[PDB]
Design a protein around this ligand. Sequence first.
Ligand SMILES: Nc1nc2c(ncn2[C@@H]2O[C@H](COP(=O)(O)OP(=O)(O)O)[C@@H](O)[C@H]2O)c(=O)[nH]1
Ligand SMILES: [Mn+2]
Ligand SMILES: [Mn+2]
Ligand SMILES: [Mn+2]
Length: 620
Amino acid sequence: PQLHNGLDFSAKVIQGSLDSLPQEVRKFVEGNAQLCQPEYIHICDGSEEEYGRLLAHMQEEGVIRKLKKYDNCWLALTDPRDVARIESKTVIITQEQRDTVPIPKSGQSQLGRWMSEEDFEKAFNARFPGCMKGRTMYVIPFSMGPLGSPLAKIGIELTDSPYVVASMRIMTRMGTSVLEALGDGEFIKCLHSVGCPLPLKKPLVNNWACNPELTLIAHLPDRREIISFGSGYGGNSLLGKKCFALRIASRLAKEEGWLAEHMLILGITNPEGKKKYLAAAFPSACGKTNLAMMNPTLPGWKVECVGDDIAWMKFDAQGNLRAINPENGFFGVAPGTSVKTNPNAIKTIQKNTIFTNVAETSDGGVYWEGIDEPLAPGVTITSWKNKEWRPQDEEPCAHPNSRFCTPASQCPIIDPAWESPEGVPIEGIIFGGRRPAGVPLVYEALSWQHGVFVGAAMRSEATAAAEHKGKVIMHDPFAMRPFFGYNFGKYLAHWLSMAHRPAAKLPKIFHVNWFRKDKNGKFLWPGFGENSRVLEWMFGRIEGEDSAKLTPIGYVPKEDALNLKGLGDVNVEELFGISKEFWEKEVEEIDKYLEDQVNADLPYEIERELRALKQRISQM
Ligand SMILES: Nc1nc2c(ncn2[C@@H]2O[C@H](COP(=O)(O)OP(=O)(O)O)[C@@H](O)[C@H]2O)c(=O)[nH]1
Ligand SMILES: [Mn+2]
Ligand SMILES: [Mn+2]
Ligand SMILES: [Mn+2]
């Protein structure tokens, strides 16, 4: 089937067999192999032998170090320029711009960056051709969700970074058994490359191969393809997490009729013997991980974890909104994780965990800001910049966006249904973000329409997750602003459509705010474990208790309704104060944001709620 041996890469397979691969799967491999020209091809099987042999290569290449104080834990230091998820260099490739983002009025579209196919082909042919020269191309077959379960998707990611192969084994279900399940079914085509072929023309920092100048993350929903280049950190290289489970999954969810959201899933049990499942949509670095692994301070309550990031939901035959966690591990922020704040996380990241950009102690341990843990006498600390660090300098020993990669099965409070194929019925949805002043601690929506409005009106201060800096209160609807896969206007309609399904059991909607400060800069709520006091009020409302009070913005707990025993000193007046001067400006910014960003694709019900809220606030 060829004139010269220039298309048959059989003599470059160090593991596996191109013959054992399905038809369309093999064509996808040899196609990019001819374009990227890898030195070798490594078809993954996910076995322990492969994972152990994969670690030795990175260690012998100066990429990762071994943390001797813990059982099979490794540290990795990356290039200082590749530490976050570049939102500015992320594009969605569709034929019509209206499919990706709503055509704005005058202003620019914050709800995504659209790029044409012609402009994408010009940049595509200017990067990949020859990027894997002298490297190994790993074929990674993973599965988002339990194998054989409903709404379970399979993908094939080709990459040249063993740091990606090791992480993909932790975050997804990858191995040979995934190929047997796929057979002749569809699969998302993923392609990743660091962009540093051999010989190296640019010296690498910390042996971290990257190309910041040419970093590009593109999505093609029409082709079911995902193409990333240049980067190699979290959501940029782990295509199954952000690019697949959210952006592309949202497009499929709109076509097929389910939901793909950036929410956590946690079940809570009360002293009376009842258990309910909740979901929370918080922006990055806003409190999703600490909430799903919470150690409550109330006796008789038990909180178990199902997920901390991705959530795929869909109605069932009985009218329930069941959800599953398509992921297999955890990829949460490191700084601030201590025994007092998130004790469940400390128990999980002590074995089979890969750390990144965190400080290392002399005795082989880990260290980061907010760890709140004394060291033994004579122990030194090495910052993430590979330098000797002391608490007297200004350089932090660990990067703000430094992460840990740990399997989900090792969590002590993992819910015994995190891999069930049918999912868990969700009875509540929680919105919120980092709002320093104005937003009360917690309130409840008035209806399903007003609830959707609450999610669309989410705002929060810029944190340390993307490339945003400063204390700016920007908009972030549904905590999905950086992960919208199609038109946001149609997105708001997809949620409002859930109120039309027959025998629909719609869940309640709440808005919280743990970060409301006072006039001095001190948090009015301790948070973390004490957040269970707020979750208790949400549990009773679901059962139908009469503990709510009507306000111009929603339902707030009545007096003597929150279990504040043991505290008593919390300033309740300022923690639930609704100022008329504040909410008259808040709606002003909400009115200007919706008209400029959604424009003609804004549903009438979202506008009817905007007028309803404005009217009620003017009557104060
Ligand atoms: N004040 C307060 N801070 C919190 C709470 N939960 C988390 N945080 C802080 O948020 C930071 C990271 O939050 P995290 O849960 O990892 O965010 P996410 O996983 O991206 O959703 C930590 O350093 C904590 O200090 C809370 O309930 N109250
Ligand atoms: Mn996230
Ligand atoms: Mn997280
Ligand atoms: Mn309707």
